Short mmCIF file of C-alpha atoms (C1' of nucleotides) and ligand atoms in Angstrom, two decimals:
data_model
loop_
_atom_site.label_atom_id
_atom_site.label_comp_id
_atom_site.label_asym_id
_atom_site.label_seq_id
_atom_site.Cartn_x
_atom_site.Cartn_y
_atom_site.Cartn_z
CA UNK A 1 -22.99 -1.38 -57.26
CA UNK A 2 -26.24 -0.89 -59.27
CA UNK A 3 -26.98 2.50 -57.60
CA UNK A 4 -23.52 4.06 -58.17
CA UNK A 5 -23.60 3.03 -61.85
CA UNK A 6 -26.82 5.03 -62.13
CA UNK A 7 -25.26 8.01 -60.34
CA UNK A 8 -22.25 7.76 -62.62
CA UNK A 9 -24.56 8.08 -65.65
CA UNK A 10 -26.35 11.02 -64.01
CA UNK A 11 -23.06 12.75 -63.31
CA UNK A 12 -22.08 12.48 -66.94
CA UNK A 13 -25.40 14.11 -67.91
CA UNK A 14 -24.81 16.82 -65.29
CA UNK A 15 -21.44 17.47 -67.01
CA UNK A 16 -22.11 16.75 -70.71
CA UNK A 17 -25.44 18.55 -71.21
CA UNK A 18 -25.74 21.07 -68.35
CA UNK A 19 -22.04 21.87 -68.08
CA UNK A 20 -21.76 21.50 -64.29
CA UNK A 21 -19.02 19.74 -62.39
CA UNK A 22 -20.30 18.11 -59.22
CA UNK A 23 -23.64 17.34 -57.61
CA UNK A 24 -24.40 19.59 -54.64
CA UNK A 25 -25.58 18.12 -51.29
CA UNK A 26 -28.96 16.37 -51.63
CA UNK A 27 -29.12 16.28 -55.44
CA UNK A 28 -27.64 12.85 -55.90
CA UNK A 29 -29.97 11.36 -53.33
CA UNK A 30 -33.15 12.53 -55.08
CA UNK A 31 -31.80 11.63 -58.47
CA UNK A 32 -30.74 8.17 -57.30
CA UNK A 33 -34.15 7.49 -55.70
CA UNK A 34 -35.90 8.32 -58.98
CA UNK A 35 -33.47 6.20 -60.99
CA UNK A 36 -34.11 3.38 -58.48
CA UNK A 37 -37.83 3.66 -59.33
CA UNK A 38 -39.08 5.48 -56.25
CA UNK A 39 -41.60 8.33 -56.03
CA UNK A 40 -40.24 11.69 -54.83
CA UNK A 41 -41.48 14.88 -53.30
CA UNK A 42 -38.93 17.73 -53.51
CA UNK A 43 -39.53 20.97 -51.68
CA UNK A 44 -36.74 23.41 -52.59
CA UNK A 45 -37.71 26.91 -51.49
CA UNK A 46 -34.10 28.13 -52.05
CA UNK A 47 -32.99 27.77 -55.68
CA UNK A 48 -32.13 27.53 -58.40
CA UNK A 49 -32.14 24.42 -60.58
CA UNK A 50 -34.70 22.10 -59.04
CA UNK A 51 -35.73 21.33 -62.61
CA UNK A 52 -32.50 19.32 -62.77
CA UNK A 53 -33.97 16.93 -60.20
CA UNK A 54 -36.16 15.56 -62.96
CA UNK A 55 -34.35 16.60 -66.15
CA UNK A 56 -31.21 14.67 -65.38
CA UNK A 57 -32.90 11.37 -64.66
CA UNK A 58 -35.14 11.94 -67.68
CA UNK A 59 -31.93 12.01 -69.74
CA UNK A 60 -30.55 8.82 -68.13
CA UNK A 61 -33.78 6.79 -68.34
CA UNK A 62 -34.97 5.41 -71.63
CA UNK A 63 -38.42 6.54 -72.57
CA UNK A 64 -40.42 9.67 -72.31
CA UNK A 65 -40.70 11.93 -69.29
CA UNK A 66 -43.94 13.86 -69.03
CA UNK A 67 -43.68 17.16 -67.20
CA UNK A 68 -46.90 18.72 -65.97
CA UNK A 69 -46.81 22.52 -65.88
CA UNK A 70 -49.34 25.12 -64.85
CA UNK A 71 -48.43 27.72 -67.40
CA UNK A 72 -47.87 27.92 -71.14
CA UNK A 73 -45.20 30.54 -70.51
CA UNK A 74 -43.38 28.21 -68.11
CA UNK A 75 -43.59 25.38 -70.64
CA UNK A 76 -41.99 27.62 -73.25
CA UNK A 77 -39.20 28.93 -70.98
CA UNK A 78 -38.16 25.42 -70.00
CA UNK A 79 -38.47 23.82 -73.41
CA UNK A 80 -36.41 26.62 -74.91
CA UNK A 81 -33.61 26.20 -72.30
CA UNK A 82 -33.55 22.46 -72.86
CA UNK A 83 -33.39 23.05 -76.66
CA UNK A 84 -30.42 25.41 -76.05
CA UNK A 85 -28.63 22.48 -74.31
CA UNK A 86 -29.45 20.17 -77.19
CA UNK A 87 -32.12 18.09 -75.39
CA UNK A 88 -35.14 16.77 -77.30
CA UNK A 89 -37.84 18.67 -75.45
CA UNK A 90 -41.27 19.68 -76.56
CA UNK A 91 -44.63 20.82 -75.38
CA UNK A 92 -48.32 20.73 -76.18
CA UNK A 93 -50.74 23.57 -75.78
CA UNK A 94 -53.58 25.39 -77.44
CA UNK A 95 -51.50 28.02 -79.22
CA UNK A 96 -49.97 25.40 -81.43
CA UNK A 97 -51.50 24.68 -84.82
CA UNK A 98 -52.92 21.19 -85.17
CA UNK A 99 -50.14 20.12 -87.53
CA UNK A 100 -47.56 21.31 -85.01
CA UNK A 101 -49.26 19.20 -82.31
CA UNK A 102 -49.40 16.17 -84.57
CA UNK A 103 -45.67 16.42 -85.14
CA UNK A 104 -45.02 16.57 -81.37
CA UNK A 105 -47.25 13.55 -80.82
CA UNK A 106 -45.36 11.58 -83.54
CA UNK A 107 -42.05 12.56 -81.90
CA UNK A 108 -43.35 11.13 -78.56
CA UNK A 109 -44.50 7.99 -80.34
CA UNK A 110 -41.08 7.42 -81.99
CA UNK A 111 -39.03 8.29 -78.95
CA UNK A 112 -37.55 11.41 -80.59
CA UNK A 113 -38.98 13.48 -77.73
CA UNK A 114 -37.43 12.85 -74.30
CA UNK A 115 -39.38 15.46 -72.33
CA UNK A 116 -42.91 16.54 -73.04
CA UNK A 117 -44.30 19.58 -71.23
CA UNK A 118 -48.09 19.55 -70.92
CA UNK A 119 -51.00 21.02 -68.90
CA UNK A 120 -53.17 18.71 -66.76
CA UNK A 121 -56.37 19.61 -68.62
CA UNK A 122 -54.89 18.21 -71.84
CA UNK A 123 -53.17 15.29 -70.19
CA UNK A 124 -56.23 14.10 -68.23
CA UNK A 125 -58.58 13.79 -71.19
CA UNK A 126 -59.61 10.10 -71.41
CA UNK A 127 -58.59 9.66 -75.00
CA UNK A 128 -55.19 11.28 -74.35
CA UNK A 129 -54.57 8.90 -71.46
CA UNK A 130 -55.30 6.04 -73.86
CA UNK A 131 -52.75 7.24 -76.43
CA UNK A 132 -50.09 7.34 -73.65
CA UNK A 133 -50.51 3.63 -72.96
CA UNK A 134 -48.83 2.94 -76.27
CA UNK A 135 -45.80 5.26 -75.70
CA UNK A 136 -42.74 4.25 -73.72
CA UNK A 137 -43.30 6.18 -70.53
CA UNK A 138 -40.26 6.55 -68.19
CA UNK A 139 -41.39 9.11 -65.58
CA UNK A 140 -43.91 11.76 -64.71
CA UNK A 141 -42.82 14.97 -63.09
CA UNK A 142 -45.16 17.61 -61.70
CA UNK A 143 -43.56 21.02 -61.45
CA UNK A 144 -44.99 23.77 -59.22
CA UNK A 145 -46.63 20.82 -57.43
CA UNK A 146 -48.19 23.08 -54.78
CA UNK A 147 -50.76 23.81 -57.55
CA UNK A 148 -52.17 20.35 -56.98
CA UNK A 149 -53.30 21.48 -53.55
CA UNK A 150 -53.79 25.19 -54.18
CA UNK A 151 -55.83 24.77 -57.40
CA UNK A 152 -56.93 21.18 -57.66
CA UNK A 153 -59.80 21.48 -55.16
CA UNK A 154 -61.58 24.31 -57.05
CA UNK A 155 -59.97 26.49 -59.71
CA UNK A 156 -58.39 23.74 -61.86
CA UNK A 157 -59.80 20.32 -60.85
CA UNK A 158 -57.72 18.39 -63.34
CA UNK A 159 -54.85 19.22 -60.99
CA UNK A 160 -56.50 16.91 -58.46
CA UNK A 161 -57.16 14.31 -61.17
CA UNK A 162 -53.48 13.41 -61.79
CA UNK A 163 -53.67 10.61 -59.25
CA UNK A 164 -55.83 8.78 -61.83
CA UNK A 165 -52.85 8.90 -64.17
CA UNK A 166 -50.71 7.55 -61.36
CA UNK A 167 -52.94 4.49 -60.86
CA UNK A 168 -53.04 3.81 -64.63
CA UNK A 169 -49.21 3.63 -64.71
CA UNK A 170 -48.13 2.01 -61.42
CA UNK A 171 -44.73 1.02 -62.72
CA UNK A 172 -43.63 4.56 -63.77
CA UNK A 173 -42.12 6.73 -61.01
CA UNK A 174 -43.78 10.03 -60.24
CA UNK A 175 -41.95 13.12 -58.99
CA UNK A 176 -43.57 16.24 -57.54
CA UNK A 177 -41.47 19.47 -57.12
CA UNK A 178 -42.31 22.74 -55.47
CA UNK A 179 -40.67 25.72 -53.85
CA UNK A 180 -43.34 26.46 -51.24
CA UNK A 181 -45.27 23.81 -49.34
CA UNK A 182 -46.21 23.53 -45.67
CA UNK A 183 -46.98 20.18 -44.09
CA UNK A 184 -50.63 20.34 -45.11
CA UNK A 185 -49.73 21.01 -48.73
CA UNK A 186 -47.12 18.25 -48.73
CA UNK A 187 -49.54 15.68 -47.42
CA UNK A 188 -52.17 16.91 -49.86
CA UNK A 189 -49.74 16.43 -52.75
CA UNK A 190 -48.85 12.87 -51.69
CA UNK A 191 -52.56 12.01 -51.34
CA UNK A 192 -53.92 13.61 -54.53
CA UNK A 193 -51.08 12.46 -56.70
CA UNK A 194 -51.02 8.93 -55.21
CA UNK A 195 -47.29 8.99 -54.41
CA UNK A 196 -46.19 5.67 -52.97
CA UNK A 197 -44.08 6.03 -49.82
CA UNK A 198 -42.11 8.85 -51.47
CA UNK A 199 -38.65 10.09 -50.66
CA UNK A 200 -39.46 13.51 -49.17
CA UNK A 201 -36.61 16.07 -49.33
CA UNK A 202 -37.11 19.54 -47.88
CA UNK A 203 -34.44 22.19 -47.97
CA UNK A 204 -34.30 25.40 -46.04
CA UNK A 205 -36.79 28.24 -46.21
CA UNK A 206 -34.28 30.83 -44.89
CA UNK A 207 -33.64 33.85 -47.15
CA UNK A 208 -31.14 35.84 -45.11
CA UNK A 209 -30.91 38.74 -47.54
CA UNK A 210 -34.65 39.41 -47.39
CA UNK A 211 -35.69 41.83 -44.67
CA UNK A 212 -39.28 41.15 -43.56
CA UNK A 213 -41.07 44.31 -42.52
CA UNK A 214 -44.64 45.19 -41.57
CA UNK A 215 -46.23 48.62 -41.24
CA UNK A 216 -49.61 49.30 -39.71
CA UNK A 217 -51.88 50.71 -42.37
CA UNK A 218 -53.32 54.18 -41.50
CA UNK A 219 -53.17 56.32 -44.67
CA UNK A 220 -52.66 53.57 -47.22
CA UNK A 221 -51.78 55.66 -50.26
CA UNK A 222 -49.62 58.22 -48.54
CA UNK A 223 -47.68 55.50 -46.69
CA UNK A 224 -47.25 53.54 -49.90
CA UNK A 225 -46.12 56.68 -51.76
CA UNK A 226 -43.62 57.57 -49.05
CA UNK A 227 -42.31 54.00 -49.08
CA UNK A 228 -42.00 53.89 -52.89
CA UNK A 229 -40.17 57.24 -52.91
CA UNK A 230 -37.67 55.94 -50.36
CA UNK A 231 -36.68 53.15 -52.80
CA UNK A 232 -35.34 55.87 -55.08
CA UNK A 233 -35.72 54.16 -58.48
CA UNK A 234 -35.37 50.55 -57.31
CA UNK A 235 -37.19 47.74 -59.08
CA UNK A 236 -40.12 46.18 -57.10
CA UNK A 237 -43.57 44.59 -57.00
CA UNK A 238 -46.71 45.86 -55.24
CA UNK A 239 -49.33 43.19 -54.59
CA UNK A 240 -53.02 43.96 -54.04
CA UNK A 241 -55.98 41.67 -53.47
CA UNK A 242 -58.25 43.01 -56.31
CA UNK A 243 -58.07 44.03 -59.98
CA UNK A 244 -59.70 47.36 -59.22
CA UNK A 245 -57.21 48.16 -56.44
CA UNK A 246 -54.34 47.28 -58.80
CA UNK A 247 -55.67 49.71 -61.47
CA UNK A 248 -56.24 52.53 -58.96
CA UNK A 249 -52.87 52.13 -57.32
CA UNK A 250 -51.12 51.90 -60.64
CA UNK A 251 -52.90 55.07 -61.86
CA UNK A 252 -52.32 57.07 -58.69
CA UNK A 253 -48.60 56.25 -58.79
CA UNK A 254 -48.34 57.25 -62.46
CA UNK A 255 -49.95 60.54 -61.47
CA UNK A 256 -46.97 61.25 -59.12
CA UNK A 257 -44.57 60.34 -61.99
CA UNK A 258 -43.55 56.86 -60.85
CA UNK A 259 -42.67 54.19 -63.39
CA UNK A 260 -45.51 51.81 -62.57
CA UNK A 261 -47.90 49.59 -64.56
CA UNK A 262 -50.83 47.38 -63.58
CA UNK A 263 -50.80 43.61 -64.16
CA UNK A 264 -53.77 41.27 -63.70
CA UNK A 265 -55.68 38.50 -65.54
CA UNK A 266 -58.35 40.83 -66.98
CA UNK A 267 -55.71 42.46 -69.17
CA UNK A 268 -55.00 41.16 -72.67
CA UNK A 269 -52.22 38.57 -72.99
CA UNK A 270 -50.06 40.82 -75.19
CA UNK A 271 -50.26 43.63 -72.58
CA UNK A 272 -49.35 41.28 -69.71
CA UNK A 273 -46.43 40.02 -71.81
CA UNK A 274 -45.22 43.56 -72.47
CA UNK A 275 -45.43 44.61 -68.81
CA UNK A 276 -43.52 41.50 -67.70
CA UNK A 277 -40.92 41.91 -70.46
CA UNK A 278 -40.49 45.60 -69.63
CA UNK A 279 -40.14 44.88 -65.93
CA UNK A 280 -37.49 42.30 -66.81
CA UNK A 281 -35.66 44.73 -69.15
CA UNK A 282 -35.66 47.31 -66.32
CA UNK A 283 -37.71 49.60 -68.61
CA UNK A 284 -40.41 49.46 -65.92
CA UNK A 285 -39.59 50.19 -62.28
CA UNK A 286 -42.66 48.84 -60.58
CA UNK A 287 -45.37 46.26 -61.32
CA UNK A 288 -48.63 46.63 -59.39
CA UNK A 289 -50.32 43.26 -59.42
CA UNK A 290 -52.69 40.60 -58.29
CA UNK A 291 -51.56 37.00 -57.68
CA UNK A 292 -51.51 36.60 -61.49
CA UNK A 293 -48.04 38.18 -61.48
CA UNK A 294 -46.08 35.28 -60.23
CA UNK A 295 -44.75 31.97 -61.42
CA UNK A 296 -41.91 32.09 -63.94
CA UNK A 297 -40.48 35.46 -63.17
CA UNK A 298 -36.72 35.16 -63.40
CA UNK A 299 -35.78 38.67 -62.46
CA UNK A 300 -32.76 38.63 -60.17
CA UNK A 301 -32.86 42.22 -58.95
CA UNK A 302 -36.33 42.80 -57.49
CA UNK A 303 -35.38 44.83 -54.45
CA UNK A 304 -38.76 45.23 -52.83
CA UNK A 305 -42.02 43.30 -52.64
CA UNK A 306 -44.86 45.27 -51.13
CA UNK A 307 -48.04 43.63 -49.92
CA UNK A 308 -50.52 46.47 -49.93
CA UNK A 309 -53.14 43.99 -48.77
CA UNK A 310 -52.30 41.07 -46.53
CA UNK A 311 -52.34 37.77 -48.52
CA UNK A 312 -54.68 34.89 -47.88
CA UNK A 313 -52.06 32.62 -46.33
CA UNK A 314 -48.44 32.28 -45.34
CA UNK A 315 -47.49 30.17 -48.37
CA UNK A 316 -48.65 32.94 -50.75
CA UNK A 317 -46.79 35.44 -48.65
CA UNK A 318 -43.63 33.32 -48.63
CA UNK A 319 -43.83 32.73 -52.37
CA UNK A 320 -44.50 36.35 -53.22
CA UNK A 321 -41.96 37.91 -50.88
CA UNK A 322 -39.51 35.34 -52.23
CA UNK A 323 -39.46 36.98 -55.66
CA UNK A 324 -37.27 39.64 -54.06
CA UNK A 325 -33.51 39.39 -53.81
CA UNK A 326 -32.94 36.33 -55.97
CA UNK A 327 -29.38 37.68 -56.73
CA UNK A 328 -28.46 37.42 -53.02
CA UNK A 329 -28.26 41.13 -52.24
CA UNK A 330 -30.34 43.01 -49.62
CA UNK A 331 -34.03 43.11 -50.48
CA UNK A 332 -37.06 44.15 -48.49
CA UNK A 333 -40.53 42.68 -48.08
CA UNK A 334 -43.00 45.22 -46.76
CA UNK A 335 -46.48 44.35 -45.57
CA UNK A 336 -49.03 47.12 -44.97
CA UNK A 337 -51.33 45.57 -42.39
CA UNK A 338 -54.90 46.55 -41.62
CA UNK A 339 -56.76 44.15 -39.34
CA UNK A 340 -59.94 45.07 -41.18
CA UNK A 341 -58.40 43.38 -44.26
CA UNK A 342 -58.27 40.15 -42.26
CA UNK A 343 -61.91 40.43 -41.33
CA UNK A 344 -62.67 40.84 -45.07
CA UNK A 345 -60.79 37.64 -45.92
CA UNK A 346 -62.38 35.72 -43.01
CA UNK A 347 -65.76 36.76 -44.37
CA UNK A 348 -64.87 35.48 -47.89
CA UNK A 349 -63.86 32.09 -46.49
CA UNK A 350 -66.78 31.30 -44.22
CA UNK A 351 -69.29 32.01 -47.00
CA UNK A 352 -68.37 28.84 -48.95
CA UNK A 353 -69.04 25.15 -48.09
CA UNK A 354 -68.30 24.19 -44.45
CA UNK A 355 -65.99 21.21 -43.81
CA UNK A 356 -62.30 20.08 -43.61
CA UNK A 357 -61.12 22.10 -46.65
CA UNK A 358 -62.51 25.32 -45.26
CA UNK A 359 -61.02 24.52 -41.83
CA UNK A 360 -57.63 24.18 -43.52
CA UNK A 361 -58.03 27.48 -45.36
CA UNK A 362 -59.29 29.15 -42.13
CA UNK A 363 -56.33 27.78 -40.23
CA UNK A 364 -53.91 29.10 -42.88
CA UNK A 365 -55.51 32.51 -42.98
CA UNK A 366 -55.39 32.59 -39.18
CA UNK A 367 -51.72 31.80 -39.25
CA UNK A 368 -51.18 34.75 -41.68
CA UNK A 369 -52.95 36.99 -39.17
CA UNK A 370 -50.83 35.68 -36.34
CA UNK A 371 -47.68 36.45 -38.34
CA UNK A 372 -49.01 39.99 -38.86
CA UNK A 373 -49.82 40.41 -35.14
CA UNK A 374 -46.68 38.67 -33.84
CA UNK A 375 -44.53 40.39 -31.23
CA UNK A 376 -41.71 38.01 -31.96
CA UNK A 377 -39.19 37.80 -34.79
CA UNK A 378 -41.04 37.50 -38.14
CA UNK A 379 -38.57 35.02 -39.46
CA UNK A 380 -39.04 32.78 -36.45
CA UNK A 381 -42.76 32.70 -37.18
CA UNK A 382 -42.26 31.90 -40.87
CA UNK A 383 -39.56 29.35 -40.41
CA UNK A 384 -41.37 27.50 -37.65
CA UNK A 385 -44.63 27.64 -39.57
CA UNK A 386 -42.83 25.63 -42.27
CA UNK A 387 -41.52 23.08 -39.72
CA UNK A 388 -37.95 24.47 -39.76
CA UNK A 389 -37.02 24.60 -36.08
CA UNK A 390 -35.32 27.79 -34.97
CA UNK A 391 -35.36 29.86 -31.74
CA UNK A 392 -32.72 32.58 -32.14
CA UNK A 393 -34.08 35.86 -33.57
CA UNK A 394 -32.88 36.97 -36.97
CA UNK A 395 -31.65 40.56 -36.45
CA UNK A 396 -33.16 41.47 -39.86
CA UNK A 397 -36.90 41.98 -39.51
CA UNK A 398 -38.99 44.85 -38.16
CA UNK A 399 -39.55 43.24 -34.75
CA UNK A 400 -35.80 42.62 -34.25
CA UNK A 401 -34.75 46.05 -35.58
CA UNK A 402 -37.42 48.05 -33.71
CA UNK A 403 -38.70 46.08 -30.71
CA UNK A 404 -42.30 46.44 -29.60
CA UNK A 405 -42.61 49.00 -26.82
CA UNK A 406 -45.54 48.91 -24.39
CA UNK A 407 -47.18 51.64 -22.33
CA UNK A 408 -49.87 51.79 -19.64
CA UNK A 409 -52.91 51.95 -21.91
CA UNK A 410 -55.60 51.95 -19.21
CA UNK A 411 -56.57 55.62 -19.53
CA UNK A 412 -56.65 55.49 -23.34
CA UNK A 413 -58.81 52.39 -23.26
CA UNK A 414 -61.28 54.15 -20.94
CA UNK A 415 -61.55 57.11 -23.28
CA UNK A 416 -62.00 54.98 -26.38
CA UNK A 417 -64.38 52.50 -24.74
CA UNK A 418 -66.31 55.27 -22.96
CA UNK A 419 -66.67 57.08 -26.28
CA UNK A 420 -68.09 53.93 -27.89
CA UNK A 421 -70.48 53.52 -24.94
CA UNK A 422 -71.90 57.04 -25.20
CA UNK A 423 -72.73 56.78 -28.94
CA UNK A 424 -74.71 53.61 -28.05
CA UNK A 425 -72.48 51.22 -30.04
CA UNK A 426 -74.10 52.13 -33.38
CA UNK A 427 -71.20 53.91 -35.11
CA UNK A 428 -68.03 52.95 -36.94
CA UNK A 429 -64.35 53.63 -36.33
CA UNK A 430 -63.99 56.85 -38.32
CA UNK A 431 -66.90 58.45 -36.48
CA UNK A 432 -65.91 57.34 -32.97
CA UNK A 433 -62.44 58.82 -33.58
CA UNK A 434 -63.83 62.14 -34.86
CA UNK A 435 -65.69 62.36 -31.54
CA UNK A 436 -62.50 61.51 -29.60
CA UNK A 437 -60.46 64.35 -31.08
CA UNK A 438 -63.22 66.95 -30.64
CA UNK A 439 -63.33 67.67 -34.35
CA UNK A 440 -66.78 69.13 -35.16
CA UNK A 441 -68.57 68.36 -38.44
CA UNK A 442 -72.30 68.35 -39.34
CA UNK A 443 -73.02 64.90 -37.85
CA UNK A 444 -71.51 65.84 -34.46
CA UNK A 445 -73.52 69.04 -34.03
CA UNK A 446 -76.57 67.50 -35.77
CA UNK A 447 -76.75 64.39 -33.54
CA UNK A 448 -75.58 66.56 -30.60
CA UNK A 449 -72.32 64.77 -29.72
CA UNK A 450 -70.45 68.07 -29.17
CA UNK A 451 -72.20 68.40 -25.77
CA UNK A 452 -71.15 64.92 -24.56
CA UNK A 453 -68.47 64.80 -21.88
CA UNK A 454 -66.15 62.48 -23.85
CA UNK A 455 -66.22 64.72 -26.96
CA UNK A 456 -62.67 65.97 -27.52
CA UNK A 457 -61.15 64.14 -24.56
CA UNK A 458 -58.47 62.75 -26.91
CA UNK A 459 -57.84 65.85 -29.07
CA UNK A 460 -54.35 65.96 -27.53
CA UNK A 461 -53.48 62.80 -29.58
CA UNK A 462 -53.55 61.94 -33.30
CA UNK A 463 -56.21 60.02 -35.16
CA UNK A 464 -53.50 57.40 -35.84
CA UNK A 465 -53.01 56.91 -32.10
CA UNK A 466 -56.72 56.25 -31.53
CA UNK A 467 -57.06 53.93 -34.53
CA UNK A 468 -54.24 51.82 -33.05
CA UNK A 469 -55.79 51.88 -29.55
CA UNK A 470 -59.10 50.70 -30.98
CA UNK A 471 -57.58 48.13 -33.30
CA UNK A 472 -55.80 46.76 -30.25
CA UNK A 473 -59.02 46.56 -28.16
CA UNK A 474 -60.68 44.66 -31.03
CA UNK A 475 -57.80 42.22 -31.10
CA UNK A 476 -57.96 41.79 -27.32
CA UNK A 477 -61.67 40.94 -27.69
CA UNK A 478 -62.85 44.02 -25.74
CA UNK A 479 -64.46 45.69 -28.79
CA UNK A 480 -66.14 44.12 -31.83
CA UNK A 481 -66.51 45.46 -35.32
CA UNK A 482 -69.24 43.18 -36.65
CA UNK A 483 -69.95 43.73 -40.37
CA UNK A 484 -73.43 42.50 -39.36
CA UNK A 485 -74.32 46.08 -38.37
CA UNK A 486 -72.13 47.85 -40.92
CA UNK A 487 -68.92 47.50 -38.88
CA UNK A 488 -70.30 49.34 -35.85
CA UNK A 489 -68.04 49.30 -32.79
CA UNK A 490 -69.78 47.27 -30.07
CA UNK A 491 -68.51 46.41 -26.59
CA UNK A 492 -68.11 42.88 -25.22
CA UNK A 493 -68.24 41.41 -21.71
CA UNK A 494 -64.53 42.18 -21.20
CA UNK A 495 -65.12 45.94 -21.65
CA UNK A 496 -66.58 46.51 -18.18
CA UNK A 497 -63.55 46.15 -15.87
CA UNK A 498 -61.45 48.43 -18.13
CA UNK A 499 -64.24 50.96 -18.51
CA UNK A 500 -64.47 51.29 -14.70
CA UNK A 501 -60.74 50.66 -14.74
CA UNK A 502 -59.33 48.57 -11.92
CA UNK A 503 -58.11 45.90 -14.37
CA UNK A 504 -54.63 47.00 -15.54
CA UNK A 505 -53.64 47.15 -19.24
CA UNK A 506 -50.51 47.47 -21.34
CA UNK A 507 -50.81 48.57 -24.97
CA UNK A 508 -48.19 48.82 -27.70
CA UNK A 509 -46.99 51.91 -29.55
CA UNK A 510 -47.89 51.65 -33.26
CA UNK A 511 -45.55 50.40 -36.00
"C1'" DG B 1 -73.46 54.58 -43.58
"C1'" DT B 2 -68.51 53.21 -43.64
"C1'" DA B 3 -64.00 54.46 -45.25
"C1'" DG B 4 -60.39 56.32 -47.58
"C1'" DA B 5 -58.87 59.90 -51.22
"C1'" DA B 6 -59.56 64.02 -52.96
"C1'" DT B 7 -61.19 68.41 -52.43
"C1'" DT B 8 -61.39 72.43 -50.31
"C1'" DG B 9 -59.28 77.04 -48.15
"C1'" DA B 10 -55.23 72.31 -41.80
"C1'" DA B 11 -59.84 70.18 -40.29
"C1'" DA B 12 -64.28 70.20 -42.77
"C1'" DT B 13 -66.72 68.89 -47.13
"C1'" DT B 14 -68.05 66.20 -50.92
"C1'" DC B 15 -66.81 62.11 -53.93
"C1'" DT B 16 -66.09 57.74 -54.84
"C1'" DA B 17 -67.49 52.47 -54.18
"C1'" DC B 18 -68.79 49.13 -50.42
"C1'" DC B 19 -64.16 44.83 -51.49
"C1'" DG B 20 -61.19 38.35 -54.93
"C1'" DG B 21 -58.11 36.12 -57.14
"C1'" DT B 22 -55.31 32.67 -59.66
"C1'" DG B 23 -55.44 29.19 -66.56
"C1'" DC B 24 -55.89 25.58 -69.10
"C1'" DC B 25 -59.26 24.04 -72.71
"C1'" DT B 26 -62.75 25.55 -76.72
"C1'" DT B 27 -61.86 19.52 -82.63
"C1'" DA B 28 -71.00 20.91 -81.89
"C1'" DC B 29 -76.14 15.95 -81.49
ZN1 LIG C 601 -36.28 38.96 -36.74
#
DNA sequence: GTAGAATTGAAATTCTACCGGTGCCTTAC
């Protein structure tokens, strides 16, 4: 009785303001829970109107809905769309004049405004919280709610402070929405936001039109160039883990004539805006970017997402690869993997404060590395990482399309390990390989490694082959590459039996 | 002192840099 009357009102809003006909599966349930006064956590990795989960009940309820958003540009996109549908929406941010802000605040006070978009830093100021007490507050919705967990612990602490708001207003329902959240992030959102036994609704993470590919990184730039050229004019994004790398890569692509521009947070806001706008207008083919190029990109025809450096966790990977193929047509995610890049990230993590937070981050990084090293379907790894049970392989990932192939690697291991032995475990990868292929430069003849027996024993095979062999022995735990001594290749206890070679060994051909 | 890109006349030689990254808010004691 009381719950269907609510849903009836919601349906009319769905029709009258948004112009849709029927609720899809799951929508009515979330919307009803919110109308019934319950807290909600909505995880909709799919698409494409999860904003409706709060906008519709904000238009049925009497009072103001506050929507917390991480980005001025998001605030503006959503307020503008609501204004186009005739809804009294507004926002507050620092690019407004004071008199503009005052008029928004008076609108909230009078009930003219129905939805107010606002950043947590403004919202969580003590005095602002006090002014809210006097408004008629119907709901609080936190968009891109993964930011609570991903930013609230360090980069933007007011994201973690929103629970204080929750306790100040126990009678107003709170809703958190996100597209990417593993179990850890979900629990972190519930905790930090103080959600009270929330309805949790999680839809599928499957993107069947995205093909997940990985390529072992040997000649980064040449492989990237060859890959970009094979896209033959297609629109795409190339992610790197540093501003510098983004500038270089951008430049070096422009050199070869490719429509590419750099995008990162050290560029001026009018440049970033132009790059994004161009990319959207299809006036730019490729954006080369840090994580700054991200939220609030509604470009439906991104055909490839390249990770030139492996991301810091699977959620970032999922979210970034997921910008491809939003129109439903074949798109490709392509990861260029160097294990050394993992070691770099591991190093960055275990420099900061020990404890539970770092163990979570280390776990999530480690999971990213396991996805990269998997010899099973990539999609099975992703989907199961997110708690979506599946066992059948996808047929549309690099492991499924080109299965791993193993060979007797015993002899190769001997050569590589023996070569590392002879140089007394004081030299890096590049050097040890030079030795292996019998290629003579000054340092070989100078140090006298051209007379050694192992010198040139692997000249019959490429430097790519030996990098893969050695990368594999590091992964197996036979060889270390401790940054401690400038990434010198050292042998471990497990080296011995292979070096004498009665312990058998399969290796994999490189990807 | 490694590593990858670029430079040299394909393997050797310099030549670079050796590694984070995300955004709100700025209303003076
Ligand atoms: Zn697969």
